[PDB]
Amino acid sequence: FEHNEALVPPYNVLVDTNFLSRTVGAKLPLLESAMDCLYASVNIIITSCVMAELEKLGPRYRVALMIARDERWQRLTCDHKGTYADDCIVDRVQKHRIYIVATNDRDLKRRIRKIPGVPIMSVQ
Amino acid sequence: ITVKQTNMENIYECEFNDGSFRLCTRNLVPNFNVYGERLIKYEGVEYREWNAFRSKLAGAILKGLKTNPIRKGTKVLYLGAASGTTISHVSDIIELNGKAYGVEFSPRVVRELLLVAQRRPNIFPLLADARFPQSYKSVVENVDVLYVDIAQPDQTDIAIYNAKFFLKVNGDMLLVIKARSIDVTKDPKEIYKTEVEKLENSNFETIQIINLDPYDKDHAIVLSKYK
Amino acid sequence: ASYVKFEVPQDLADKVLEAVRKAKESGKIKKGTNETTKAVERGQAKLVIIAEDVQPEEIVAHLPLLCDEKKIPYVYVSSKKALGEACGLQVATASAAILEPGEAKDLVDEIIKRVNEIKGKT
Amino acid sequence: KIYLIEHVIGAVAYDENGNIVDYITNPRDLGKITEELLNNEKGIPFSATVELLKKVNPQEVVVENEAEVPKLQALGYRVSYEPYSKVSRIFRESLPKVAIDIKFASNEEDYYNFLHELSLEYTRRKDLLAIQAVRAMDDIDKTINLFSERLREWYSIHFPELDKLIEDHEEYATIVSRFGDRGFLTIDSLKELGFNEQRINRILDAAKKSIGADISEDDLSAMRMIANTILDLYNIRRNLNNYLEGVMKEVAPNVTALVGPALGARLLSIAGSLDELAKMPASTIQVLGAEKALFRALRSGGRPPKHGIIFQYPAIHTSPRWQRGKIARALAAKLAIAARVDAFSGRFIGDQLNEQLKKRIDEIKEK
Amino acid sequence: SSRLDAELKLAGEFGLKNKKEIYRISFQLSKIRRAARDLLTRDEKDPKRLFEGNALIRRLVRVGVLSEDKKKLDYVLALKVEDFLERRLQTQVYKLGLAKSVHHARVLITQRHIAVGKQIVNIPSFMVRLDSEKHIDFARPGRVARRNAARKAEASG
RNA sequence: GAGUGGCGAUGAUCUGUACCCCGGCGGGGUGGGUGUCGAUGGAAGUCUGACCGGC
């Protein structure tokens, strides 16, 4: 598609809040799942906005938070945690179309496909 | 030939006998060149040709550096001054008012920096290890620009450490990211991303990130403001 | 010898001579101390190779200093006859430079990264 | 609690707020500061600091460097250190200024003059005269010629025939200097400088039959001022050559072995320093001087100079035009090696270098 | 699309090595099971982790594998794909002078010429290991490789 | 029986192919640009004229 590649191990993957919930309440090993599909070392991360949003969810749905605050995902310190998870990831990946995005938000995925060179992952 | 000012102070462009455009600076010591560079007289004022292939700053300009924080009367701490190529050009830019503190830990090379710094009251040479700012704490003052071009794997960390010693709050840091001397194995583009994050996870506000290609392979320069 | 800055194990020394040969074939090299110098001064060189048995040592002594200013990595080999004979010459050479690696890019990138490790870095 | 600062400027004590509680200014002496800075590296406190810690009597002190702590504990105080402390920053923020306030320098102008020279000397601790000398020599050469040219044009109003009779400028000048008028010229006085039998006669006959002008003593002495200046410069030149030889053998013996002191120095002058000459490829050394000729060739793709200031080497300018480029190339190559053994230390190996060079020249000449 | 820009990537590797198909598919799957089974470390040092260890680790390889480390060979999943690619004559036989440039190479690999120290090796996608012997052999004779030995300085990687 | 003399980075090639000439070479001239200076040399080669003011 005319997109010049320069991705190198370990892949940087932003995991969104929905994916985190999902993998938690269905017992899906998110870390190993990504290393499996990317077939290489992966650094799994979550923006501060995504994990904050989880924090609210965490008030009545305990379990996502702990996994989401795990070193496996390493925090990506965005400048705008206040912005919906969706917009957060979008504004972070818009300058760094480098990072792979794992999201359950088919709306966020659609608007990321626009940007050349953004691997997209999700759970069926 | 024609020489004229650019958007940035004391930095000029030349129209040439043939129609080429090259950067130059106003010669602080007329009749004298530091490397092999061309000396050029126009309307009775002498300018030093600024080869982009040698000087990373000239490179960054030619790759569209928004705003250059190095100007008339600026105080710069220059980590990795080497033989004096680039630092001589920042001496020209800064003029007698401003000051450049050149830190360099390779004696073989400070040898040739000495010659540059003798001729130029602007430049204060220092044979010391940028990893220990304590060893030159007692000669330098605080500064406006932290220009950092050092071949070290932990170059970024070194830069941040010097910053919290010497960089003025709201001052600027030009940091050269040498992919191949941080790690020859990793992808240059993965390195640029992870080093910038170190600056952000301190408190530097990334202003602009330039890729120095044609001029410097596997290099990127970051401009950011310390808070 | 004193112009030798660090220690190169023979495995690496052989991987260097290999890298040079493939670069004659598929890329562009410079051979000889003067031409190597000009290649550094001009910033063209990606890797500089210096022999350890140069006989007046000082002939290549300026290269470490020069390469550091221009931030071009350099490496050692033990025989100058061996480097020249790699270079496609039938005589010795004291120093050489790789300008474009061609079909040795992968091989060079491993060298410029091993000499980083045995130099310090990370 | 007292926060202590050490700087080139002296030793300053601050409180936690960032106010100078007390200070002791250093002496404005390059020698002593440099040494105390070198000493500070090993943890030894400034002597200004020792005096300051007495004047103030502080219970808890905090320094900049961790190596100092145990030294000041051995001196009687309870001590710690803070790395990039707010105080240390506060001090350097006002460091252009507080140099004047504690009277280390009268103004900013020569705080920086001093600090520049401290830095120069402090790194020196961790060839210029050769260059200057040859540059003056070259000025003198130039001037001798200008004056001699003038003198001949001037003095020939009186004695025109003497100009084509004396080739040598120094000789010509000696005659005008000792005589002025041509009717003051004598077999005796001319023998008394070693002019040969036959030549003295041709001079005196030319002076006798001269179609020159008869001219006052005021006019002649005007001319004789120039003649004496010319004579003065020749002596100064010869003195400068011996001086130059002295320094050149000391600073770059191998180079001097190859091309002589003057030309050796001359290359240093163009290169800027010995280390700069040492960093050069032969192909540069071969063309130094001759920049106009070089860049003309590089801009247009024309023919380059075979030789710059190197032209002066006897083997080149005396040799026929088709040999010169080869001789130059061989010389430059050797000079690059010469400069490098000279730069990166010590050993004289100028004899084999000369021997190798003369081998190369002998081969060139047999074609 | 990512599908698209992928179908770019592949064509990039399509002479980032030299192939003409989906041998990129070959090597790919490889990388899978390599990782895969491997990545199934998991686990401990089960005397199994042991044999498998120096085992898959003895992937090295020459022209093949990594260099000197691991353990974690998923690095390969990064490499392998982008590394296992070279190694074999398909790659590491241009990067040795003889071959004028990949193409001008596979052709001799096939066309009788180009042989691994005795015996040709038409299988124009063998694998290299202890290479210094990858000459022409030839047995008037293999011309394209026998005189154009500009490889007489093919010191490459 | 003792000492010397032995390709080589500590370094061969490429281009100043000048022209062509007479005997790859000797010599020759014509060439290039470049160091010197010169000559005297060559340069619309040597301003303008109605009224200027003070009153």
DSSP track, C20-32: HHHHHHHSEEEES
Give the CA-trace dihedral at D131, D134, D138, D141, to 10 degrees.
Answer: 170
User: Among B31, B59, B17, which residue's Cα sits nearest to residue B149?
Assistant: B59
E67 neighbors E14 (Cβ within 8 angstroms)? no
Instruction: Give the CA distances from residue D318 to residues C73, D321, D324, E76, in Å, rounded to whole numbers and listed in that order.
Output: 44, 9, 9, 68
Question: D44, C107, A8: which is closest to E131 by C-alpha?
Answer: C107
Rounded to whole angstroms, how far apart are CA atoms D219 and C118?
81
Instruction: Please provide residue D323's backbone torsions phi and psi, each rounded to the nearest 5 degrees.
Output: -90, -25
- C-alpha span between D39 and D44 (Å, rounded): 5
Closest CA to B83 of C65, A41, D125, A2: C65
Does at least one atom of strand F sit less than 7 Å from the CB of C89? yes
| Backbone φ/ψ region at A74: left (φ over 0), alpha (ψ -120 to 50), beta | left
- Please tell me the distance from the alpha carbon of residue B122 to that of residue A18, in angstroms, as a whole number: 58
Taken as a whole, chain B contains a residue count of: 227
Residues of B in contact with C122 (CB under 8 A): 153-154, 182-183
Q: What is the DSSP letter of D45?
A: P
CB within 8 A of D1, min separation 6: which ones? D15, D16, D58, D59, D60, D61, D62
Across-strand partners of C49? Answer: C75, C96
| Chains contacting B (3+ CB pairs below 8 angstroms) | A, C, D
The nucleotide minimizing the C1' distance to residue D334's CA is: F10
CB contact A8 to B (< 8 Å): yes
For residue D359, give the nucleotide whose C1' atom is nearest its CA: F11
The gap between A51 CA and F55 C1' (Å) is 99
Question: Do D26 and D53 touch, CB atoms closer than 8 A?
Answer: no
- D187 backbone dihedrals φ, ψ, rounded to 5°: -40, -45
DSSP H/E element including B49:
strand B45-49
Distance CA C65, CA B53 (A): 18
Collapse the DSSP code of A120 into the 3-class scheme (helix H, G, I; strand E, B; otherwise coil) and give the result: strand
**CB distance B150 to B158 below 8 Å:** yes
Of C35, C41, C58, the CB nearest to D340: C58
Task: Name the token pair of D357.
Answer: 């060079």
What does the alpha-carbon distance between residue A123 and residue A104 come to, in Å, rounded to a whole number?
7
Beta carbons of C111 and C12 less than 8 angstroms apart: yes
Interface of C with E in 38-67 (CB under 8 A): none
Question: What is the C-alpha to C-alpha distance for residues E69 and B84, in angstroms, rounded to an integer?
Answer: 39
Report the residue from A8, A77, A96 with minimal CB separation from B200. Answer: A77
Rounded to whole angstroms, the distance from the CA of residue D10 to the C1' of nucleotide F32 is: 68
Distance from CA of E65 to the nearest CA of A (A): 15
Q: How many Å apart are CA B84 and CA B90, to the nearest integer? A: 10
C15/B220 Cα distance (integer angstroms): 29
User: Are residues D302 and D174 in contact, defined by beta-carbon separation less than 8 angstroms?
Assistant: no
**Residue D206 contacts residue D162 (beta carbons within 8 Å):** yes
E–D touching, 3+ CB–CB pairs within 8 Å: no
C-alpha to C-alpha distance for D191 and D193, rounded to whole angstroms: 5
Question: Would you say A51 and A75 are in contact if contact means Cβ atoms under 8 Å apart?
Answer: yes
Cβ D212 vs Cβ D160: under 8 Å: yes
d(CA A83, CA A48): 10
* Cβ within 8 Å, pair C116-B183: yes
Give B-chain residues touching C114 at CB under 8 angstroms. 184
The distance of B146 to chain C (nearest Cα, Å) reads 19
C62 touches strand F (CB under 7 A): no
Give the Cα separation of C59 and D74 in Å (integer): 51
Angle at B75 between CA B70 and CA B76, to 5 degrees: 70
Give residues with Cβ within 8 angstroms of A94, minimum separation 6: A115
**Rounded-to-integer distance, Cα B139 and Cα E36, Å:** 58
Q: Does A40 touch chain B (CB under 8 A)?
A: no
Nearest protein residue to F25's C1' (by CA)? D367
Strand pairing of A11-15 and A100-102?
parallel
Cα dist from C100 to A105, B213, D364, E36, E81, whole Å:
46, 15, 36, 37, 24
Helices (H), chain D: 30-40, 47-55, 69-73, 86-93, 98-101, 109-125, 128-155, 169-178, 187-191, 197-208, 217-251, 253-259, 261-271, 274-278, 282-285, 291-300, 314-318, 321-343, 350-364
Option in C34, C56, C62 nearest D283 (CB) = C34
Say yes or no for a CB contact (<8 Å) between C69 and B184: no
Tell me which H or E stretch contains C84. Answer: helix C80-86
Provide the positions of strand F that have an atom within 7 A of a protein CB. 8-12, 16, 18, 25-26, 31-34
Q: Which of C16, C118, C121 to mutate to test the interface with B (most CBs of B within 10 A)?
A: C121
| Helix or strand (DSSP H, E) at B174 | strand B167-178
How many C-beta atoms lie closer than 10 Å to residue D43's C-beta? 15
Strand partners, C47: C98
Q: B173, B86, B169: which is closest to B123 by C-alpha?
A: B86
- Amino acid E8 reads L
Flag whether A37 is marked binding: no
Å from the D320 CA to the F30 C1': 18
Closest CA to D91 of D34, D9, D27, D32: D9
C76 touches C13 (CB < 8 A): yes
Cβ D192 vs Cβ D175: under 8 Å? no
> Cβ separation of A1 and E7 shorter than 8 Å?
yes
Identify nearest nucleotide to residue C85 by CA to C1′ distance. F9
CA-to-C1' span, D300 to F27 (A) = 35
Q: Is the peptide bond before A87 cis (omega within 30 degrees of 0)?
A: no
What is the signed CA dihedral for D118, D119, D121, D124, rounded to 10 degrees? 170
Q: How big is the CA angle at B42 (ends B38 and B44), to the nearest 5 degrees?
A: 115
Q: What distance in Å separates the CA atoms of residue D129 and residue B116, rounded to the nearest whole number?
A: 16
Per the CB < 8 A criterion, the answer to whether A73 and A64 are in contact is: no
Among E27, E28, E29, E77, most A C-beta atoms within 10 A, so best to mutate, is E77
Q: Please work out, in degrees rounded to the nearest 5, the angle formed at the alpha carbon of residue D127 by the alpha carbons of D126 and D128.
A: 95
- Pairwise CA distance, residues B77 & B57, whole Å: 14
Contact C25 E86 (CB under 8 A): no
CB D111 within 8 A of CB D99: yes
C3, C34, C56 ranked by CB distance to D281: nearest: C34
- Whether C86 CB is under 7 Å from strand F: no
| D65 touching chain B per CB within 8 A | yes
**3-class DSSP state for residue E70?**
coil
Backbone angles phi, psi at B16, to 5 degrees: -115, 160
**What's the rounded Cα separation, in Å, for the pair E100 and E78?**
29
Region for residue E118 given its phi and psi (left: phi exceeds 0; alpha: psi -120 to 50; beta: otherwise):
left
In this complex, the nucleotide whose C1' atom is nearest to the CA atom of residue C31 is F9
Is residue B189 reached through a cis peptide bond, with omega within 30 degrees of 0 on the bond before it? no
Q: How far is the CA of C78 from the C1' of F46 (A)?
A: 77
For residue E40, the distance in angstroms to the closest alpha carbon of chain C comes to 28
C104–E98 CB contact, under 8 Å? no
How wide is the angle at C-alpha D16 spanned by C-alphas D10 and D18, nearest 5°? 55
B17, B1 contact by CB (below 8 A) = yes
Helix (H) or strand (E) holding C75: strand C74-77
Substitution target from C62, C63, C65 for chain D, most D beta carbons within 10 A: C62
State the distance between the two ends of chain B, measured CA to CA, in whole angstroms.
Answer: 44
Contact of D96 with B141, CB cutoff 8 Å: yes
> Does the nearest atom of strand F lie within 7 Å of D297's Cβ?
no
User: Which residue in B has a C-alpha nearest to residue C114's C-alpha?
Assistant: B184
| C48 Cβ contact list (under 8 Å, min separation 6) | C36, C39, C40, C63, C67, C72, C73, C74, C75, C95, C96, C97
Count of beta carbons in the 10 Å neighbourhood of residue D214: 10
Show which residues on chain A lie within 8 Å of chain E, measured between beta carbons: 1-3, 5, 8-10, 35-36, 38-41, 113, 116-120
- CA distance, residue D334 to nearest chain C CA (Å): 10
Task: Kindly determine whether the C-beta of residue C39 is less than 7 Å away from any atom of nucleic acid strand F.
Answer: no
Q: Tell me the β-bridge partners of B226.
A: B204
CA distance readout (Å), C48 to B217, C19, C93: 15, 11, 13
Give me the DSSP letters along D184-209. Answer: G--HHHHHTTT--HHHHHHHHHHHHT
Between CA E79 and CA B218 the distance in angstroms is 19
Six token digits for residue D367 = 């074609």
E78 touches chain A (CB under 8 A): yes
Q: What's the resolution in A? A: 7.3
HSE, CB side, 13 Å, CA atoms: give it for residue E23: 17
Q: Is D245 exposed, middle or buried (0-12, 13-18, 19+ CB in 10 A)?
A: middle
Could you give phi then psi for residue C29, rounded to 5 degrees? Answer: -115, 165
C65 interfaces chain B, CB cutoff of 8 Å: yes
Show Cβ contacts of residue A111 under 8 Å, excluding neighbours closer than 6 positions. A90
CA/C1' separation C69–F12 (Å): 33
Chain C neighbours, 3+ Cβ pairs < 8 A: B, D, E
Sheet containing C47-51, strands listed edge to edge, beginning at the edge strand earlier in sequence: C28-31, C95-100, C47-51, C74-77
**Terminal CA-CA length for chain C:** 27
Which residues of chain D from 283 to 312 reach within 8 Å of chain C, CB to CB? 283
Question: What method was applied to determine this entry?
Answer: cryo-EM
From D82, D113, D114, D111, select the one nearest D98 (Cα to Cα). Answer: D111
